Structure 1
Amino acid sequence: TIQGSIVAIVTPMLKDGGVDWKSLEKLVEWHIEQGTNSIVAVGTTGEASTLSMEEHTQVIKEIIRVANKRIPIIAGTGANSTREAIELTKAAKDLGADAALLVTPYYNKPTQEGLYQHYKAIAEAVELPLILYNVPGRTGVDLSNDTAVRLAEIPNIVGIKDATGDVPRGKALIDALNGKMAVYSGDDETAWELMLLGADGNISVTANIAPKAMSEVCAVAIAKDEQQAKTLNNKIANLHNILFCESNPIPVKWALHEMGLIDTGIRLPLTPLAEQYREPLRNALKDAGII
């Protein structure tokens, strides 16, 4: 049901890596003001991997507190252990999240059946809307379209974030589902295209720095206005490239820093954007009218 521009929000940090609670509050308010439709708290772009359990709770709690029910909040609760995924997703429910976003277990390479049992076990453990998330380049595993369609039969599995960037494959999944659960782009470069083909929105990195513009791209693409979708997307299309010149969220955090909205903190093994990428990033932001 959640539709539109869903920012995968960064977790702003001080130089020493501590979470920057004031900057996070200001970002949430700005997204709401700028037309962002939903926020994913503590997902990939939010450095879920390097936050403690207590930090994951606090960030979700703070985002929900600041948003004050103006937009739905989706909590990142993915783990590569089924048991830990259940605990994080129960926590998210108890905090009042509207939905949970669960990447396929990474590193341990479950079979397709183990992927199916993993998400079925979580859906049966926790009464909360769950959104699957496939990003094979990170996880070493690819949740096939067939398995996703099977999981769409489980009642609180309500959608999937498709970060393949493979538009023909994503269109095939949307067609096979025939509305049984939602598809969201996880690939800013092609998201406008996948939404014109039926996706319910874009769980977006670029929306961190261009929330108004991405809100407008999602809205027109979801309305099936191909000319406007291309028109609006072209204004920010170079951002969808440059924000991946190193592994997300390294560039997008540096971008936000150039915008004066967060400090440079980012936790190892991630590192501040390498100096050789900074001028090209600065140039792209200036070209897009962002700074």
Structure 2
Amino acid sequence: TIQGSIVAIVTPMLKDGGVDWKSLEKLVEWHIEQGTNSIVAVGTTGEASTLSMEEHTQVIKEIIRVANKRIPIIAGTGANSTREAIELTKAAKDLGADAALLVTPYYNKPTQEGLYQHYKAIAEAVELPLILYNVPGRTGVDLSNDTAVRLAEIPNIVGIKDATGDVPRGKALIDALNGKMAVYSGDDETAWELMLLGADGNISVTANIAPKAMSEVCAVAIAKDEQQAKTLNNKIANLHNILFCESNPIPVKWALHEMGLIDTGIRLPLTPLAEQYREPLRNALKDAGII
């Protein structure tokens, strides 16, 4: 169901590290304006890790309050604790979220069976649509294809954000599923292919700075028009790259700063994009005509 360009929105902040609400609001209007099809409130890009449970909720609320049921809101509710995860996902449901995005427990390295029990428990406790998120590189674990298929077997588990970048792998998964649950790309670099291979959209980082372009690439990629997917994606490829020259979302948050859309806020352990990649990013933004 949820399709298109789904931007994983940053959580704008002030120089001191407090959430920047006036700037958060403006960004939601701007995505809805620009053609963004949905939004993940407080995902990895949203500095979920450095936000308190209250800020997590406040943001989820604000994004839902400014969206005003105009486009669906997916609430970031992952945790490396099953219990903790149930608490954020219910909070989300109560706040009126359309769906929840739960990354695989990071750092405690659960077994594949633990990964199965973890999600099932969450699925049977809060009646909300749930979208799994696999990004081994960050978590320390890797939700196998077979595990994903066992889970698509659960009422409430409706999709899986796939950030491997491993396309044929992503393809195997989409095929094995036969439409039982959605798949979205969690890798901007190869999202156009994944969607061209039948993925329901991209939970995009690049979409923070180029929402129109992206939703256009998504539309035509889900539409199965190979050449336009390539042709329009190519206009923004350089961006999928330069936005990870440092850990996401260090750069995109600097990208948005150069765009004049947010202040330089970012919570430690994260840091402002290193002075070294600031001209390199500034040009890439100019080559793409975003400024």
Place the TM-score, normalised by the shorter chain, in its bin: over 0.9
The unaligned stretches of length 5 or more in structure 2 are none
The offset of 1:211, in angstroms, is: 0.1
Question: Counterpart of 2:286 in 1: which secondary structure?
Answer: helix
CA distance in 2, matches of 1:152, 1:39: 22
CA distance in 2, matches of 1:191, 1:155: 27
The offset of 1:274, in angstroms, is: 0.2
CA distance in 2, matches of 1:290, 1:55: 30
The offset of 1:24, in angstroms, is: 0.2
- Sequence identity percentage: 100
The offset of 1:246, in angstroms, is: 0.2
CA deviation profile, 1:130-155 (whole Å, cap 9, x unmatched) = 00000000000000000000000001
Residue in structure 1 matched with residue 241 of structure 2 by the alignment = 241
**Number of positions where the alignment pairs a residue of Structure 1 with one of Structure 2:** 291
Correspondence 1:125-164 to 2 at 5 A: 125-164=125-164
The offset of 1:204, in angstroms, is: 0.2
The offset of 1:81, in angstroms, is: 0.2
The offset of 1:101, in angstroms, is: 0.1
Question: Counterpart of 1:16 in 2: which secondary structure?
Answer: coil
The offset of 1:200, in angstroms, is: 0.1
CA deviation profile, 1:22-68 (whole Å, cap 9, x unmatched) = 00000000000000000000000000000011000000000000000
The offset of 1:107, in angstroms, is: 0.2
The offset of 1:126, in angstroms, is: 0.4
Question: Counterpart of 1:26 in 2: which secondary structure?
Answer: helix
Question: Counterpart of 2:203 in 1: which secondary structure?
Answer: strand
CA distance in 2, matches of 1:3, 1:208: 17
Question: Counterpart of 1:229 in 2: which secondary structure?
Answer: helix
CA distance in 2, matches of 1:42, 1:107: 19
CA distance in 1, matches of 2:110, 2:270: 26
Question: Counterpart of 1:184 in 2: which secondary structure?
Answer: strand
The offset of 1:102, in angstroms, is: 0.2
CA distance in 2, matches of 1:221, 1:176: 20
The offset of 1:15, in angstroms, is: 0.1
Residue in structure 1 matched with residue 41 of structure 2 by the alignment = 41
CA deviation profile, 1:162-216 (whole Å, cap 9, x unmatched) = 0000000000000000000000000000000000000000000000000000000
CA distance in 1, matches of 2:20, 2:87: 25
CA distance in 2, matches of 1:121, 1:9: 27
Residue in structure 1 matched with residue 256 of structure 2 by the alignment = 256
The offset of 1:159, in angstroms, is: 0.1
Task: Indicate yes or no: 2:286 matched with 1:276.
Answer: no
CA distance in 2, matches of 1:198, 1:91: 32
The offset of 1:19, in angstroms, is: 0.4
CA distance in 1, matches of 2:53, 2:126: 18
CA distance in 2, matches of 1:219, 1:174: 18
Task: Indicate yes or no: 2:231 matched with 1:231.
Answer: yes
Greater than 3 Å deviation, 4+ residue runs: none
Question: Counterpart of 2:75 in 1: which secondary structure?
Answer: strand
CA distance in 1, matches of 2:268, 2:262: 18
The offset of 1:122, in angstroms, is: 0.2
TM-score by length of 1: 1.00
The offset of 1:92, in angstroms, is: 0.2
CA distance in 1, matches of 2:162, 2:215: 19
The unaligned stretches of length 5 or more in structure 1 are none
